[PDB]
Amino acid sequence: ASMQKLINSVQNYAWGSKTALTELYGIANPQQQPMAELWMGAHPKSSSRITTETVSLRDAIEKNKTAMLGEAVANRFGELPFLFKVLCAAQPLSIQVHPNKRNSEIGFAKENAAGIPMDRNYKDPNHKPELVFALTPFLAMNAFREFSDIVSLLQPVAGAHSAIAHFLQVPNAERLSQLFASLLNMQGEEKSRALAVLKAALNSQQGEPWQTIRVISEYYPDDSGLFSPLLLNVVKLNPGEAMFLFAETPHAYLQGVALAVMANSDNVLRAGLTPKYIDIPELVANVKFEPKPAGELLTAPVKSGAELDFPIPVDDFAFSLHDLALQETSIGQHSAAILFCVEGEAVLRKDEQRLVLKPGESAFIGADESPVNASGTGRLARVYNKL
Numbered sequence: 223a224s225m226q227k228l229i230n231s232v233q234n235y236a237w238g239s240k241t242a243l244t245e246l247y248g249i250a251n252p253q254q255q256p257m258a259e260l261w262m263g264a265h266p267k268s269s270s271r272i273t274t275e276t277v278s279l280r281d282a283i284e285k286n287k288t289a290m291l292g293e294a295v296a297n298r299f300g301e302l303p304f305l306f307k308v309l310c311a312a313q314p315l316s317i318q319v320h321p322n323k324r325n326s327e328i329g330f331a332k333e334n335a336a337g338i339p340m341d342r343n344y345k346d347p348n349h350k351p352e353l354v355f356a357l358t359p360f361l362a363m364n365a366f367r368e369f370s371d372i373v374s375l376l377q378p379v380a381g382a383h384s385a386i387a388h389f390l391q392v393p394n395a396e397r398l399s400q401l402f403a404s405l406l407n408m409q410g411e412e413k414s415r416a417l418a419v420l421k422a423a424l425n426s427q428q429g430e431p432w433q434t435i436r437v438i439s440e441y442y443p444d445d446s447g448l449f450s451p452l453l454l455n456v457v458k459l460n461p462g463e464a465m466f467l468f469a470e471t472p473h474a475y476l477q478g479v480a481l482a483v484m485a486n487s488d489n490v491l492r493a494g495l496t497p498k499y500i501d502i503p504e505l506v507a508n509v510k511f512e513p514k515p516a517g518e519l520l521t522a523p524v525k526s527g528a529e530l531d532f533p534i535p536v537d538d539f540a541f542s543l544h545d546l547a548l549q550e551t552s553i554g555q556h557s558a559a560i561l562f563c564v565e566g567e568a569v570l571r572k573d574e575q576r577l578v579l580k581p582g583e584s585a586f587i588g589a590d591e592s593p594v595n596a597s598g599t600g601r602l603a604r605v606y607n608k609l
Contacts, residue, residue: 224572224591226272228279228560228584233242233259233268239312242479246357247582260308262560262584262605264301265486272586279586283558292557292589294609306560306605307482308357308582314438314476316496317363317447317454320350320509322469329504343501345488348528351536352484353387353521355603356459357564358559360478361434363454365471365514369393375452378427382419382449383408395511402453403506404584406494413446431456438476438495447494447545450474457519464521464532464541469512481562483605485538527551540608546598554593557607561585566600 232243238258243249251257261268264280272279283290283302295303321329329344354362367375373393376386385404389397408416410468424436431451439448454472459465459480467473472493491505524531528545544553546568553561561570563579570577570585572594577585579602587594596602 223273224575224588225570225577225594226279226586226588227579228262228586229271229273229276229579231261231268231270231413233258233261235259237311237313237315239479242310242312242358243308243582246479246579249582256312259310260582262306262308262562263304265305270584270586275608283434284294286376289590290609291586292555295557295589295607298537298609299485302558303485303607304560304605305484305486306584307484308479309354309475309482310479311475311477313441314495315474316490316498317472317474317493319472319491319493319505319509320352320467320469320487320489321491323349325508326487328349329489343489343491343504345587346486347491348485348487348489349469349536349538350485350487350489351469351534351538352482353464353532353534353539353541354459354467354475355481355532355541356461356465357479357481357485358461360459360461360480361437361476362457362465363451363472363474363476364460364465364467364519365455366398366453366511367455368513368515372417372453375431378423379419379449379452382416382552383412398453398511399455399506399509402493402509402511403452403502405449406500406502406505410444413444416446417444417448431604434476442495445495447496450494455514455516455519457516459520464523465519466521466534468583470508471514472509477583481564481603483539483541485536502506529553532543537609540606542604542606544596544602544604546596546600546602550595550597551591553596553602553604553607554603556589556592557609559592559604559606561587561594561596562603563604564601564603567598568596568600568602569598571595571597 235258238256330347
């Protein structure tokens with residue numbers, strides 16, 4: 223078959239919503255398990271499957287790389303270079319940073335030399351560029367706030383810690399770095415003091431990011447990450463909006479449902495909202511302490527015919543949305559593609575074959591099977607490579 227409907231995995235991580243996937247797409251969950259992530263791709267741990275008998279998408283690609291991926295992706299990556307997910311965050315997730323490519327390679331080589339098997343921040347030598355696209359209103363943190371914004375936010379908790387006072391004396395990148403590390407490094411009475419002052423300020427301060435801090439404290443009451451919304455931009459993505467997560471930039475998924483597309487990596491440098499040990503010097507060596515203005519946080523899409531492209535500044539993946547109507551639209555690429563029904567209903571056509579996609583269902587299109595003709599109502603999301 224030319225268009226392959228995907229059989230996808232649902233990760234039942236503790237933080238997932240028990241209802242979102244059911245409410246959105248009619249996905250069954252008779253025992254009310256948390257359903258955190260719906261995986262669309264060829265990940266070795268849990269590959270999407272296709273019906274021929276079902277076979278692993280990963281194994282199918284590996285048997286015919288050039289035909290499935292196209293020559294460009296095949297020669298550059300040697301595999302499907304992205305993973306595509308529905309993320310259903312009922313609880314706040316950890317604050318994360320991903321090193322750039324060069325440092326991810328060095329980190330990988332360092333840990334190989336040390337002999338850490340998989341207990342381990344650099345499981346591979348890849349970067350992890352990522353894009354998030356809101357399906358429901360989506361609360362996140364992304365990047366450092368403007369210095370004067372940080373200054374405005376920290377003065378009501380200046381007595382929490384001397385590193386805060388130190389930054390407020392001279393609000394620059396060096397002291398932002400020290401404050402960042404000092405906050406993550408807090409211990410005992412230093413930490414309880416700082417956390418006591420923050421909690422009290424929640425009663426005298428109103429609105430954002432204070433409300434977000436309160437939200438997070440329900441799940442992470444003893445975490446120094448509670449200060450991060452005073453350092454990092456808090457963004458509330460409306461459904462249809464998107465944001466790219468740059469290398470060396472702290473970010474966190476706090477609440478809601480989104481599409482996430484990322485290059486293939488399991489590397490992560492945690493920067494709070496987690497019970498796990500954190501290599502602070504490593505984290506700091508891989509963070510760029512440059513403020514990002516709110517005006518530059520969202521990805522500005524480009525609309526052309528029925529196609530809404532979200533420009534991505536890396537080659538690892540591309541992402542677009544497609545308006546469906548009664549009249550058909552050809553959707554074509556020089557790579558493999560995964561098509562996902564966001565809303566409405568998609569009828570795909572390749573020569574003789576029809577494939578219907580209801581919301582939340584997805585299909586894999588091999589490079590050699592592009593293009594397809596799409597019609598129906600609502601919107602289809604596509605992940606692919608532009609190369």
